[PDB]
Ligand SMILES: Nc1nc2c(ncn2[C@@H]2O[C@H](COP(=O)(O)OP(=O)(O)NP(=O)(O)O)[C@@H](O)[C@H]2O)c(=O)[nH]1
């Protein structure tokens with residue numbers, strides 16, 4: 001059985017800024033193979049309960065709703081359903097609508113920096 | 124290229140600074156990273172021709188530093204083969220193979236095959252290196268004892284290399300690729316289910 005040297009080297013994903021971020025957050029980098037394929041995950045609307053300058057309120061939140069099987073996001077293992085999306089390439093999603101956050105991801109899809117608050121799986 | 128007839132997921136673990144990242148970068152790009160930057164999580168892909176056909180090799184680099192223990196299991200799901208690393212001139216790294224690394228991957232992925240990989244073998248004959256070890260009555264690890272550990276810990280086999288000189292470098296991955304393909308049973312049964 002003949003095995004060649006490696007070819008077409010490509011960095012796909014990583015976790016960055018781990019030391020300067022809250023432990024409950026994860027900043028992920030995704031670099032898709034080519035312009036034409038999808039990042040591989042959908043996002044939905046939702047509400048997040050937070051302690052605001054005025055108290056505990058339920059504010060609009062963005063969450064991952066599913067992963068395409070065999071897709072990019074899924075292959076990395078860095079994104080799961082129920083993870084809340086907080087930021088996309090330096091732009092926070094708080095004052096943003098679902099469609100805007102969707103547009104932002106498509107705009108930055110060739111080099112995506114997405115910061116999420118992972119969901120915890122029951123042990 | 125754009126396609127592969129099979130995807131082999133290879134995850135690399137081992138003490139901080141044993142040479143995991145250089146091993147990977149040296150193999151895939153023929154470049155030897157300059158200075159040491161601890162890894163948190165890095166994923167790359169290359170295409171390797173096996174039998175004249177394209178195969179996708181998904182390479183997953185992990186954090187040797189225990190500060191990041193919490194994040195490590197993220198690399199484990201769907202792994203086909205594991206490379207457990209230790210520097211042949213680092214007795215402590217070798218010890219951690221039996222005390223942390225093999226227990227950890229075997230705990231998470233009980234049926235996934237793993238290779239024991241000795242790294243930085245070009246340092247076996249390095250003065251500074253040999254002096255410091257001896258300065259505390261230590262010697263490098265020999266292929267003999269290394270192979271014995273592989274055996275005891277149930278590793279597919281032991282292989283050693285140097286990312287710097289690339290000696291034995293390609294063979295570590297070829298063997299990895301083989302460990303992921305050879306077993307007489309379905310590959311799905313060997314793939315980590317997490
Ligand atoms: N002489 C020699 N030195 C090496 C070799 N491989 C790695 N090193 C040395 O080890 C340092 C750390 O290498 P690195 O690949 O980043 O290893 P690590 O296992 O990934 N560290 P971490 O777990 O923190 O990410 C390098 O700066 C280099 O000096 C080798 O094959 N020969």
Ligand SMILES: [Mg+2]
Nearest residue numbers: 143144161162
């Ligand atoms: Mg590293």
